[PDB]
């Protein structure tokens, strides 16, 4: 519970990189690190469905760097409370997504899988 | 400070152009302490 | 919000409470309201 | 115990009806050690910061335990440890805590 750390990075599309403010459509990237390694990754996009990614199943798509090598703990305003991650995760259908990666046996065991399995 | 070069490369190639998170309460409190602790 | 005991404590001992703004919590949730509509 | 941190921005009543730019904000912070308040910190716009530690400063601190404050139910109130610690340090908090232990 104390080794669990949560980060958020607002972003804009590289296509809107050099446009005026009113044309920069914002999304948000989220990561849940279980100790050094990302257990859950989540992306809110302005123009497509949310992307949900869990360790094991989605390893090739997710951030590959550990917490120390991301530098996120050194980026001011990046860190968020657990609740700020979970509220979004839940609204995006993250529980059904994680549960499905467990049952299909694609998910790597993490603090996140343990918490869901405790519920079920 | 900031994220590593490996992360900046990852984020731009895979996600997008990172934007700043604004907390006025962090900022303004630190601005006040700049004045107080002078 | 906080309890009536805390609001009473705070207004009497400290001052008038103001809002904390998080644009990223607000905007992310507005976006999801649209997606989930 | 779970360590939880809370921040309430505030203004003096004298500033209540002023333009947003002329309202001089202060900030109130609490560190709860489980249900019990451990540290209280007040950043004021016109007077020195107030640092309070449980044990030494109990009569000056909020007497309510975490559940009876409702701070866990106020959107925006909860902060991360570093948002409390950065300010605590800048106010002379580390020596204040150290000197409190001896006395």
Short mmCIF file of C-alpha atoms in Angstrom, two decimals:
data_model
loop_
_atom_site.label_atom_id
_atom_site.label_comp_id
_atom_site.label_asym_id
_atom_site.label_seq_id
_atom_site.Cartn_x
_atom_site.Cartn_y
_atom_site.Cartn_z
CA UNK A 1 0.00 0.00 0.00
CA UNK A 2 2.96 2.31 0.67
CA UNK A 3 5.02 0.99 -2.29
CA UNK A 4 2.09 1.96 -4.54
CA UNK A 5 2.68 5.20 -6.45
CA UNK A 6 0.45 6.99 -8.94
CA UNK A 7 1.35 9.47 -11.67
CA UNK A 8 -0.51 11.61 -14.22
CA UNK A 9 0.79 13.48 -17.29
CA UNK A 10 -1.54 15.71 -19.27
CA UNK A 11 -0.73 15.71 -22.99
CA UNK A 12 -1.82 17.07 -26.36
CA UNK A 13 -1.68 15.34 -29.75
CA UNK A 14 1.64 15.81 -31.59
CA UNK A 15 -0.56 16.97 -34.49
CA UNK A 16 -1.72 19.99 -32.41
CA UNK A 17 1.84 20.66 -31.14
CA UNK A 18 2.22 23.98 -33.02
CA UNK A 19 -1.39 25.19 -33.06
CA UNK A 20 -3.13 27.91 -31.05
CA UNK A 21 -4.31 26.99 -27.47
CA UNK A 22 -8.00 26.68 -28.51
CA UNK A 23 -6.99 23.95 -31.01
CA UNK A 24 -4.96 21.87 -28.54
CA UNK A 25 -7.24 18.99 -27.46
CA UNK A 26 -6.02 17.54 -24.14
CA UNK A 27 -5.73 13.96 -22.94
CA UNK A 28 -4.25 12.37 -19.80
CA UNK A 29 -1.77 9.53 -19.26
CA UNK A 30 -1.80 7.63 -15.94
CA UNK A 31 0.51 5.06 -14.37
CA UNK A 32 0.22 2.92 -11.27
CA UNK A 33 3.62 1.67 -10.09
CA UNK A 34 3.73 -1.32 -7.75
CA UNK A 35 7.13 -0.62 -6.26
CA UNK A 36 9.56 -0.16 -9.17
CA UNK A 37 7.27 -1.56 -11.89
CA UNK A 38 4.13 -0.31 -13.61
CA UNK A 39 1.14 -2.48 -12.74
CA UNK A 40 -1.51 -0.42 -14.59
CA UNK A 41 -1.44 2.15 -17.37
CA UNK A 42 -4.36 4.28 -18.54
CA UNK A 43 -4.83 6.92 -21.29
CA UNK A 44 -7.69 9.36 -21.72
CA UNK A 45 -7.78 10.58 -25.31
CA UNK A 46 -9.84 13.47 -26.73
CA UNK A 47 -10.62 11.70 -30.05
CA UNK A 48 -10.78 7.92 -29.40
CA UNK A 49 -11.67 5.35 -26.71
CA UNK A 50 -9.66 5.20 -23.45
CA UNK A 51 -6.71 2.81 -23.49
CA UNK A 52 -6.32 0.42 -20.53
CA UNK A 53 -3.16 -1.62 -20.06
CA UNK A 54 -2.09 -4.10 -17.37
CA UNK A 55 1.30 -5.72 -16.62
CA UNK A 56 1.78 -9.12 -18.24
CA UNK A 57 -0.91 -8.89 -20.92
CA UNK A 58 0.07 -5.45 -22.27
CA UNK A 59 3.86 -5.39 -21.65
CA UNK A 60 4.75 -4.52 -25.28
CA UNK A 61 2.45 -1.45 -25.33
CA UNK A 62 3.17 -0.13 -21.81
CA UNK A 63 6.03 1.98 -20.49
CA UNK A 64 9.03 -0.33 -20.12
CA UNK A 65 11.06 1.80 -17.67
CA UNK A 66 11.07 1.28 -13.89
CA UNK A 67 10.02 4.10 -11.54
CA UNK A 68 13.57 5.30 -10.87
CA UNK A 69 14.48 5.53 -14.55
CA UNK A 70 11.26 7.35 -15.57
CA UNK A 71 12.17 10.33 -13.40
CA UNK A 72 8.47 10.77 -12.51
CA UNK A 73 9.23 11.15 -8.77
CA UNK A 74 11.33 14.17 -9.81
CA UNK A 75 8.67 15.72 -12.08
CA UNK A 76 6.74 18.37 -10.11
CA UNK A 77 2.92 17.91 -10.24
CA UNK A 78 3.15 14.46 -11.86
CA UNK A 79 2.33 12.43 -8.73
CA UNK A 80 -1.30 11.86 -7.74
CA UNK A 81 -3.27 10.29 -4.90
CA UNK A 82 -4.38 6.64 -5.33
CA UNK A 83 -7.99 7.89 -5.56
CA UNK A 84 -7.23 10.15 -8.54
CA UNK A 85 -6.10 7.03 -10.45
CA UNK A 86 -8.83 4.66 -9.25
CA UNK A 87 -11.76 7.00 -9.94
CA UNK A 88 -10.72 7.34 -13.62
CA UNK A 89 -9.72 3.64 -13.91
CA UNK A 90 -13.19 2.61 -12.66
CA UNK A 91 -15.09 5.04 -14.95
CA UNK A 92 -13.11 3.66 -17.95
CA UNK A 93 -14.13 0.04 -17.20
CA UNK A 94 -10.73 -0.84 -15.69
CA UNK A 95 -12.08 -3.39 -13.17
CA UNK A 96 -13.71 -5.49 -15.92
CA UNK A 97 -10.50 -5.13 -17.98
CA UNK A 98 -8.22 -6.29 -15.13
CA UNK A 99 -10.57 -9.12 -14.09
CA UNK A 100 -10.54 -10.35 -17.73
CA UNK A 101 -6.73 -10.36 -17.93
CA UNK A 102 -6.66 -12.41 -14.69
CA UNK A 103 -9.17 -15.05 -15.90
CA UNK A 104 -7.45 -15.40 -19.26
CA UNK A 105 -4.20 -15.81 -17.23
CA UNK A 106 -2.49 -13.07 -19.27
CA UNK A 107 -2.00 -10.70 -16.29
CA UNK A 108 1.20 -10.62 -14.23
CA UNK A 109 0.41 -10.77 -10.47
CA UNK A 110 0.66 -7.28 -8.92
CA UNK A 111 -0.77 -5.31 -6.01
CA UNK A 112 -3.60 -4.42 -8.43
CA UNK A 113 -4.52 -8.07 -9.23
CA UNK A 114 -4.28 -8.96 -5.52
CA UNK A 115 -6.72 -6.18 -4.58
CA UNK A 116 -9.26 -7.30 -7.21
CA UNK A 117 -8.91 -10.99 -6.23
CA UNK A 118 -9.54 -10.01 -2.59
CA UNK A 119 -12.83 -8.47 -3.76
CA UNK A 120 -13.78 -11.67 -5.63
CA UNK B 1 13.98 17.80 -11.71
CA UNK B 2 11.74 16.68 -14.61
CA UNK B 3 11.48 13.26 -16.24
CA UNK B 4 14.46 11.41 -17.70
CA UNK B 5 15.46 11.57 -21.36
CA UNK B 6 14.43 7.90 -21.76
CA UNK B 7 10.91 8.79 -20.51
CA UNK B 8 10.63 12.00 -22.60
CA UNK B 9 11.55 9.91 -25.65
CA UNK B 10 9.04 7.18 -24.75
CA UNK B 11 6.20 9.65 -24.01
CA UNK B 12 6.57 11.69 -27.23
CA UNK B 13 6.88 8.57 -29.43
CA UNK B 14 4.04 6.65 -27.80
CA UNK B 15 1.56 9.11 -26.22
CA UNK B 16 1.93 12.80 -27.11
CA UNK B 17 3.30 16.18 -26.10
CA UNK B 18 3.36 16.43 -22.29
CA UNK B 19 1.66 19.43 -20.64
CA UNK B 20 2.15 20.94 -17.19
CA UNK B 21 -0.02 20.20 -14.17
CA UNK B 22 -0.97 23.42 -12.37
CA UNK B 23 -1.39 23.55 -8.59
CA UNK B 24 -1.83 27.25 -7.62
CA UNK B 25 -1.86 26.27 -3.95
CA UNK B 26 1.64 24.72 -4.18
CA UNK B 27 2.85 27.60 -6.33
CA UNK B 28 1.36 30.47 -4.33
CA UNK B 29 2.43 28.99 -0.96
CA UNK B 30 5.99 28.66 -2.24
CA UNK B 31 5.84 32.23 -3.61
CA UNK B 32 4.74 33.46 -0.18
CA UNK B 33 7.62 31.58 1.49
CA UNK B 34 10.02 33.18 -1.02
CA UNK B 35 8.94 36.54 0.44
CA UNK B 36 8.81 35.39 4.10
CA UNK B 37 12.22 33.64 4.14
CA UNK B 38 14.07 36.37 2.23
CA UNK C 1 -17.52 18.53 2.67
CA UNK C 2 -15.98 18.70 6.13
CA UNK C 3 -18.06 18.21 9.28
CA UNK C 4 -19.89 21.06 11.05
CA UNK C 5 -17.47 20.71 13.98
CA UNK C 6 -14.48 21.22 11.64
CA UNK C 7 -16.11 24.14 9.74
CA UNK C 8 -16.93 25.69 13.12
CA UNK C 9 -13.36 25.10 14.36
CA UNK C 10 -11.82 26.47 11.11
CA UNK C 11 -13.89 29.63 10.82
CA UNK C 12 -13.31 30.47 14.49
CA UNK C 13 -9.60 29.54 14.80
CA UNK C 14 -8.17 29.96 11.28
CA UNK C 15 -10.16 31.83 8.61
CA UNK C 16 -12.47 31.52 5.63
CA UNK C 17 -11.91 28.34 3.63
CA UNK C 18 -11.26 28.66 -0.10
CA UNK C 19 -11.47 26.06 -2.89
CA UNK C 20 -8.56 24.06 -4.19
CA UNK C 21 -8.68 23.85 -8.01
CA UNK C 22 -7.46 20.85 -10.02
CA UNK C 23 -8.11 21.52 -13.73
CA UNK C 24 -6.78 18.06 -14.64
CA UNK C 25 -9.28 16.25 -12.34
CA UNK C 26 -12.08 18.49 -13.60
CA UNK C 27 -11.29 18.27 -17.34
CA UNK C 28 -10.58 14.48 -17.26
CA UNK C 29 -13.97 13.92 -15.63
CA UNK C 30 -15.82 16.30 -18.03
CA UNK C 31 -14.25 14.32 -20.91
CA UNK C 32 -15.40 11.00 -19.41
CA UNK C 33 -18.95 12.37 -18.94
CA UNK C 34 -18.96 12.86 -22.72
CA UNK C 35 -17.39 9.46 -23.54
CA UNK C 36 -19.81 7.57 -21.24
CA UNK C 37 -22.90 9.49 -22.30
CA UNK D 1 -0.72 3.46 10.54
CA UNK D 2 -1.63 5.21 7.28
CA UNK D 3 -0.20 8.70 7.03
CA UNK D 4 -2.62 11.28 5.52
CA UNK D 5 -2.10 14.95 4.61
CA UNK D 6 -4.67 17.71 4.12
CA UNK D 7 -4.57 21.30 2.95
CA UNK D 8 -7.22 24.01 3.27
CA UNK D 9 -6.50 27.36 1.57
CA UNK D 10 -7.98 30.33 3.40
CA UNK D 11 -8.42 34.08 3.55
CA UNK D 12 -8.85 36.51 6.48
CA UNK D 13 -12.53 37.63 6.83
CA UNK D 14 -11.35 41.21 6.11
CA UNK D 15 -10.55 40.03 2.53
CA UNK D 16 -13.87 38.23 1.96
CA UNK D 17 -15.39 40.73 -0.47
CA UNK D 18 -12.24 41.86 -2.25
CA UNK D 19 -11.26 41.26 -5.86
CA UNK D 20 -9.69 37.76 -6.35
CA UNK D 21 -6.30 39.48 -6.93
CA UNK D 22 -6.46 41.44 -3.62
CA UNK D 23 -7.34 38.39 -1.53
CA UNK D 24 -4.14 37.41 0.34
CA UNK D 25 -4.30 33.64 0.79
CA UNK D 26 -2.97 31.55 3.64
CA UNK D 27 -2.83 27.76 3.81
CA UNK D 28 -3.72 25.39 6.63
CA UNK D 29 -2.22 21.89 6.64
CA UNK D 30 -2.65 18.77 8.77
CA UNK D 31 -0.61 15.58 9.03
CA UNK D 32 -2.71 12.73 10.49
CA UNK D 33 -0.91 9.70 11.96
CA UNK D 34 -3.73 7.19 11.61
CA UNK D 35 -6.81 8.81 13.20
CA UNK D 36 -4.64 11.16 15.32
CA UNK D 37 -3.29 14.56 14.32
CA UNK D 38 0.53 14.55 14.44
CA UNK D 39 1.47 17.92 12.92
CA UNK D 40 -0.41 21.12 12.12
CA UNK D 41 0.99 23.91 9.96
CA UNK D 42 -0.44 27.31 9.06
CA UNK D 43 1.00 29.55 6.39
CA UNK D 44 -0.22 33.11 7.03
CA UNK D 45 -0.23 36.11 4.63
CA UNK D 46 0.82 38.74 7.24
CA UNK D 47 2.49 36.97 10.20
CA UNK D 48 5.06 34.19 10.79
CA UNK D 49 4.20 30.59 9.95
CA UNK D 50 2.70 28.49 12.76
CA UNK D 51 4.13 25.03 13.31
CA UNK D 52 2.49 22.64 15.79
CA UNK D 53 3.50 19.12 16.87
CA UNK D 54 1.32 16.71 18.90
CA UNK D 55 2.72 16.27 22.42
CA UNK D 56 4.16 19.78 22.69
CA UNK D 57 1.39 21.92 21.12
CA UNK D 58 -1.85 19.99 21.79
CA UNK D 59 -3.84 22.89 23.26
CA UNK D 60 -3.32 24.95 20.08
CA UNK D 61 -4.09 22.15 17.60
CA UNK D 62 -7.35 20.89 16.09
CA UNK D 63 -8.79 18.48 18.70
CA UNK D 64 -10.87 16.48 16.22
CA UNK D 65 -9.64 13.06 15.06
CA UNK D 66 -9.54 12.34 11.30
CA UNK D 67 -13.04 10.88 11.00
CA UNK D 68 -14.70 13.73 12.88
CA UNK D 69 -13.15 16.45 10.66
CA UNK D 70 -14.61 15.15 7.36
CA UNK D 71 -11.33 16.10 5.60
CA UNK D 72 -11.33 12.70 3.86
CA UNK D 73 -14.74 13.68 2.39
CA UNK D 74 -13.77 17.10 1.03
CA UNK D 75 -12.76 17.05 -2.62
CA UNK D 76 -9.36 18.72 -3.05
CA UNK D 77 -8.39 18.74 0.64
CA UNK D 78 -6.11 15.69 0.57
CA UNK D 79 -2.52 16.18 -0.54
CA UNK D 80 0.56 14.03 -1.09
CA UNK D 81 3.30 13.78 1.62
CA UNK D 82 5.69 16.04 -0.36
CA UNK D 83 3.10 18.82 -0.65
CA UNK D 84 3.13 18.95 3.20
CA UNK D 85 6.85 18.25 3.69
CA UNK D 86 8.21 20.86 1.23
CA UNK D 87 6.34 23.60 3.14
CA UNK D 88 7.12 22.15 6.58
CA UNK D 89 10.85 22.25 5.73
CA UNK D 90 10.78 25.83 4.44
CA UNK D 91 9.08 26.98 7.68
CA UNK D 92 11.86 25.54 9.89
CA UNK D 93 9.89 22.35 10.56
CA UNK D 94 12.73 19.86 10.90
CA UNK D 95 14.54 21.72 13.70
CA UNK D 96 11.21 22.55 15.29
CA UNK D 97 10.39 18.84 15.43
CA UNK D 98 13.90 17.95 16.67
CA UNK D 99 13.86 20.59 19.44
CA UNK D 100 10.37 19.42 20.50
CA UNK D 101 11.66 15.89 21.18
CA UNK D 102 14.27 17.09 23.73
CA UNK D 103 11.90 19.47 25.55
#
